[PDB]
Each structure stands twice: as structure tokens, then as C-alpha cells.
Amino acid sequence: IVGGTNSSWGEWPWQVSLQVKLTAQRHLCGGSLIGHQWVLTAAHCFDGLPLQDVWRIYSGILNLSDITKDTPFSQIKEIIIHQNYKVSEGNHDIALIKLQAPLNYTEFQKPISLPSKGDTSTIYTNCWVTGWGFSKEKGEIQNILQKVNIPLVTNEECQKRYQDYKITQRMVCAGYKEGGKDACKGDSGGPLVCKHNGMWRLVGITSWGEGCARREQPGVYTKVAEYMDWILEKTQSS
């Protein structure tokens, strides 16, 4: 998160950190707790990493350097990447993670309410992106959860800023004309939540951007309302 500020405990209790343990253990992406045993993230977090056994999920945390061998973590029982997701491409960048054991809810660890498919026509107005990714383009992973207030942009306006790419109806864009505020590398998979009628709702999943925080370059997110039939069929089928 480029241009954000430190978050507090209990502020974003659905935020989780997906970490890989290879020679070292490193935060790669965010995620959003959506039920006792389901986390929602971006499918590209898994590109090139063919086993779930390397992943550790951390929830109810604020500071990544607090994580030691004592910190409790969740393990992956299964990853459902959307069928039509194609590696290195940006469509259907969404995956569900079923955890091996259900998580108990605390003020520091609680799910985010999902929108309905019908909320796809809703224009939200107070949106926030959070995570531990870079604070600047070509930057580093942050220790304290960052949070930033970003305005959504219409898909037509976002399409004019990314003429080289096809920003579809299953994507949502957010950013300033001047740039400065955006998600970045390491924020991938995390929440874009908007407070609508006094309730936080998961509107996007952080997906990609031309660099980070650049002028007239809004970040692109998977639009969760367009995937609500897929989320309900895959978590219910399981």
C-alpha cells in the first residue's frame, strides 16, 4: 500500500497473510477471511507454486515481524482456482482457499460480508484497500498492516487509462487522477472493502496495476459481485 497509514487491531479483522515457506518463510499475498474455513484471494498468488503444503495463513495479526514459530497459522486443505483463470493473464483472478480447521472469530479475526451478485450495479463511495505490500513501486513488504482510502473509477474511465488491456465488467478499478494512493506488489489477493449503509462489504480482490500509484493509473481488482455465483457453488459444493 503506497500512500496508506498504519492500521489498528480489530480494524480489518478479515485481513490474512498468505505466506510461503520455501528456503525462508515470506509474506506473498493478502487474503480475506469469508467464513470459519474459507479465505478468498487472487489466483495469481499461486502461479508457479504447485503445492499447498508450502503455505501458511496468518489471521488476527497486525505486524508481520511478530510472527515467530509460536504464531498459530492455518494450513490449506484445498485451493479452488477459477476454471478460466490463465496464468500470467488477468481474467478471473480469484481463488478460494478451504482451511484445514475452522477458525474461531475474535474482534481481531472475523469474516467480511460478501456482496450479492445483484450489487454489481451499486456504486460504492467509501472504499479502502489494505495489506502488507510495497509502500512505493519497487519497494518492500511492510510490517504493520497498511490501509488506504481510494475512490472507485468507472470501467470506461479505467479502460481509457489501460487502452492496451481489456478491463472487463468482472473487474473494478480504483485510484486518484494524480496517483499517490494504491495497492502494490504484496497486497495481491487482499480486500478492497467499501462501507455501504453502515456495513463493510467485500467489493474487490487486489489484482494488478501498471506499476503502483502512478498518475492516471488506477489499480485493477476482481469484482466480487460478478463471482458470487461461483463463490456460493464452490463453497457449498464442498
From Swiss-Prot:
Lineage: superkingdom: Eukaryota
Active site: H44, D93, S188
Protein name per the record: Plasma kallikrein light chain
Intrachain S-S bonds: C29-C45, C127-C194, C158-C173, C184-C212
Whole sequence portion shown: 391 to 628 of 638
Glycosylation, residue list: N6, N63, N104
Residue stretches making up the Peptidase S1 domain: 1-236
